[PDB]
Design a protein around this ligand. Sequence first.
Ligand code: GDP
Ligand code: MG
Ligand code: ZN
Ligand code: ZN
Lengths: 113, 805, 93, 72
Amino acid sequence: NNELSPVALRQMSCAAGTTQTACTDDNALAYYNTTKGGRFVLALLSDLQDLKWARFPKSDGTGTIYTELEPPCRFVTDTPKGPKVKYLYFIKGLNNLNRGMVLGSLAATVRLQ
Amino acid sequence: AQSFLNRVCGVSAARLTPCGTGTSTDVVYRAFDIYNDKVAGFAKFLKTNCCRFQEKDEDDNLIDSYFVVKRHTFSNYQHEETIYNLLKDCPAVAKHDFFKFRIDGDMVPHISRQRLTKYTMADLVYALRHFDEGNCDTLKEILVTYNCCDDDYFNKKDWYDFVENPDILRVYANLGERVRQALLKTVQFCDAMRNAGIVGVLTLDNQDLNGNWYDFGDFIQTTPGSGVPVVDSYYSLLMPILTLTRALTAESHVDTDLTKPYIKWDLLKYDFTEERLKLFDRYFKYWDQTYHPNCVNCLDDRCILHCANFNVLFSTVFPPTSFGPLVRKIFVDGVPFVVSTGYHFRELGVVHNQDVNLHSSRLSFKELLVYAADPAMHAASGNLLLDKRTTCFSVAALTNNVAFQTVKPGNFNKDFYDFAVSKGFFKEGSSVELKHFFFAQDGNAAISDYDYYRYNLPTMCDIRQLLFVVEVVDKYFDCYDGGCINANQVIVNNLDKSAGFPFNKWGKARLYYDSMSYEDQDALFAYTKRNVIPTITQMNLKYAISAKNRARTVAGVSICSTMTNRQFHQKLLKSIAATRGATVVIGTSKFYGGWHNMLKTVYSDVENPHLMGWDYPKCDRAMPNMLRIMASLVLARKHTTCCSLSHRFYRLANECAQVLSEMVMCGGSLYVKPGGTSSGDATTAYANSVFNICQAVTANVNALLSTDGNKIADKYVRNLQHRLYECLYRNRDVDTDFVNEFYAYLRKHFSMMILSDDAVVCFNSTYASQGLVASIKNFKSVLYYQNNVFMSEAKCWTETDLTKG
Amino acid sequence: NDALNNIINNARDGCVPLNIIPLTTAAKLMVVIPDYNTYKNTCDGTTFTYASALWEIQQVVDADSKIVQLSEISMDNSPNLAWPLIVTALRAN
Amino acid sequence: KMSDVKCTSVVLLSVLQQLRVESSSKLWAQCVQLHNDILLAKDTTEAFEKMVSLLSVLLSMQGAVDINKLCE
Ligand SMILES: Nc1nc2c(ncn2[C@@H]2O[C@H](COP(=O)(O)OP(=O)(O)O)[C@@H](O)[C@H]2O)c(=O)[nH]1
Ligand SMILES: [Mg+2]
Ligand SMILES: [Zn+2]
Ligand SMILES: [Zn+2]
C-alpha cells in the first residue's frame, strides 16, 4: 500500500550552536536529502541538548547559511556506547512527510530503547 | 471447516454469513490509493487477501456491517498487533481481533477487523471523481445503502445530470454529515498517533464509511508524544467531495447539530477571521501548511491558491449578506457620502483599501469616476428588492418599476429569397435548408437568462493537483511576454462602444478616453494597486442570428474596469495574438492558408494520430471561481519586474471584485453574481483559453494516475507515473525538471489547438487506448467533479482519419 | 440619514457590508412575484413581514404597469393578470 | 413550402410588433411563443395551424384596414 520511505538518504557531519556565531565547528549528525539542485539536509541529531542554530557553508564557499531548528526530540539508543540519551532537531518548517521519512529511517536502522 | 466462522465472530453476536467459500479468501474490485516503488496511483485494483463475512440482523435480514479477516505473514501479525495495542483506546479505530487458525498442519494467523462496511471512503471518492453514467453501480449502491435515495430514483434517467435534474444535489447532500463525521474521526485518529508516537501515512482507503480506521501494516513506532501522521493524499484527494456533498452544512446550526435552528449572526459582522481558523483547526488540524484566512498575507500565487481553496469551503457557512463591498461614511465638502473602502471575498477574505481619506475638500475627476462607479452610493439610495423570480441574492431596485426588455424579430430580405427560389433552392427534400433565424423573446427573457447563474456552485478543488496543473499550464505560456504599459501605449479599436453603468448615461467610451489625460489614466491605474474598486455590470441581450431559441446575453463592464485591465494585460494579450505556431491560436487568421498551417501544426508528429473535440456545457456560468482565479494568476505571472507583490494581489482583487463576484445590473435592479466569467470583460477570450488548457491537463493527470501501474509495459511511462504521483502528493515545492518532462510528454502525445474554449486535439491513439493520455471519458469525469456539469458524448466528436480534419 | 447613521455607529470600526444597508434602512420594498401561488406564501394580505420588519402594501402593478386592486389577485382570476406582479410596500412603524 | 411559412411568420411577427402589440405582455408572450414554434417545426401541417392562430392576433385588432390591403 502507501509506503513511507522507499529508499532513504543519509548522513553528514556539520556545525551548530545556540544562535548566531555560537556556531562552533563540527558537532551534529546532519541527515541529508541530497538532490542535485543543492543539498537539502533534513534532520539534526546531537549530543548537545539545546541547539537553535546550525550552519553549512555554501558550495561556492563565499556564503554560509544558518538553519533554525525545532525544540529537541529526546530519545535513548543502544550500542557499544551502552545507552545514549540523545536529542533530535527538525529544521523548523519541516513538513510532516520529511519528519516521516527521517523518523522512519531512524527507527529502522537506529538502536533505541 | 465451519468452526472458522464460529471463531471469527468471536464473542459478539455470531449472526454471520460467509461471503466466500469456507476458509478461502474473497476477491473484490476496489479503489486503492497506493504508492510503493513498483506502482503509484489512485486506481481500482483487485483485492485478494481477505475473507469476508456479513453480519445479519435479527429477522435474519442482512445488515451493512462486515467482518473482514486478513491473512498474512507471521511477522506483520505481531507488528500490526503491537501498533493496535498501542492504538486501541481511540474511538476511531475499528475493533480488531488477532487469532490463529490451522488450515492443515499450519497455524496460520488472521487479523479480523470487525464490524466494518462494504465500501471504504476511497470507493466514494473514486466513484465521484471518475464518474461514468454507464458504469456507476457502486455509486448507486452507496447512495441507496445510506438512505440518500431509493433505487426507483435511478429510473429517472438523466438523474446524474447537474443542469437537468438539479435535485441530484439534494441527494448528494444526504451523504454530507456522514462524510463530515469521517473528517472528525480522522482528527481523533491523528491525535491518537501523535500521542502514541506512531508514524504513518493515512490513505482514504483504510477508513470505512462509518469513519473507523484499520490497516497498520505500514506504520512504525517512535517515542510517544512525537508521532506524526502524513495526511496529504487523504485530505487533498477528498477535497472535491467536501463541497459536492456539502459536508460542513451542519456548521450553520446552533450547536453543530442538524436538529437545531440556524445560527443568527449579527448582520453587521463581516470579519469571520476567527471562525475560519476555528473551522480549519476543527477539521484540518494536521494539514501542515500555513493557512492565511485573509489572502492579503499570502506569500506568492501558489499560497494564494492554497488558502483561497480553503476559503471557498469555509465561506459556505457564513451568511451571504456579509460578502461584498464594505462601505463607510466619509465626509467630502462637509457632506456625508457612503463609499466602499474594502471588500469581503468568499475566496480571499477581507481586504481593506489602503488610501481611504475622510474629510476631503473637493473631488478630482478620478475620484468622481471611482465614486460614480461604486455600487455603494447606488445601492444605498435605492428601494429594497425581493425578486422572487430568481434565486440569486438580489440587492436593490434603483428605480420604481421593473424594466421588461424584449427582443425583436429579424427583417425579411424578400428579394434575395425570391432570387434564391428562382435558382431552384429550398425545394422539398433538399439538404441545404434554413435553420438559422432571429428568434424573438418576450419580456422576462433577460432575467430568466441571468438566472442561469444558479448553475454555479461552490467548488473546492484538489489543491495538491491544481498546484501542479498550474505549473504545467503556465509552461504552456512561456513563449510570450507581458507587463504593464503606460496610458499612451494602450490601443482601443472602436472607441464608440458603450461604457457600462452608470457611465452610459453621458456618452460612449470615447468620452471617457478623451476627458482623462494620460496622467489621469495612469493615476487611476496606479490607484488600483493599493485599493479595490467594486464596479457594476450591465446585462444586455443580443440581437443576432442563431439556431436555437435560447436568449443570449453579454456583460457590459464599466469603463472604470476596462480602462485599467487594458493597461494591466494588453502587452501580454497582444503578444499572444501575434504568435504563430503556438497552442493558443487566437489571432491566427484562417485565410491565405492559415487554416492549413494551423492544422499541420496541431498534427505535429503524433504517432497514431486521432482527432478529438469536446464541449463545455454552460462554460461561462458553470466555471468555478477557483479556476477563474487560477486563470488570472497565470495571466499575471509575467509581472515579475513591473509589479510588486502587494500590487499583484490588489490587481487580482480588483479583477475578482469587478468581473467575478460583481454586482450585476439586470432589468433596473442590482443583483449579486455568484461566480463564473463575465463574458464582456477585458480578458475573456484568453482566460477561457487558460481554463481550457487547465481542464485538458488535469484530464491527462487523472487518466495517467488512475491506471493499473502494473499493467503498463513501457517502462518509461511507469516511471513517469510514479514520479507524477510523487510530484503531486509527496513533493511540496515545484520540481522544474519534471514539469518540463511532463510538458514534453504532453506535447508529444497530446497536441492541442485552443481558442477561447474551443479546442482540437491530435492524440496518440494507442496510448489513449491504454489510458496513458486523456480519452473523452476522462473529460467527462473531470467536468463532473471539477465543473459541476455533465458532458454528454453527443457533443464531443472523434475522428480517426486525418485526411478529413 | 437617521436610520443609517444609527446602524453605522453600532459597527465596531465603521465598516458595514453593503448588502445590509438597503436591508436595514430602506423605506420602500418592491417584491416581484411570478405566479399567484408565490404571491400566497409572501405578500398575502394588506401587510406582510420580511427581513425582520413589517411592510404595508400600497400600489400593486403588473407587467403593463397598470394598477391592480388586491381583490383581483384570486386563484381563478389569476390567469387574467400579466404575471410578474410588482408589489411595492412601505416599512411600517 | 414550409420555408414560405417560416418566412411569412417572420414578417407577421414583425408587423404585429410595429403595431405596438408588445405593450400587452401576455399577448406578446403568446405571439413570441407561436413565432418561435413555427421556426422550429419540421412538418408543415402544425406550422400552418400555429400560423392561422398567430394571424388571428392581427385580424382581431382594428389597426390594419384589411379590405383595402386585399386589393388583389
Ligand atoms: N507479499 C504480499 N503482501 C501483501 C499481499 N496482500 C497484502 N499484502 C500486504 O498487506 C497489506 C494489506 O493492505 P490492504 O490490502 O490495504 O489491507 P487492508 O487495508 O487491511 O484491507 C499491504 O500493506 C500489503 O503490502 C500479498 O498477496 N502478498
Ligand atoms: Mg488498506
Ligand atoms: Zn496563504
Ligand atoms: Zn505590472
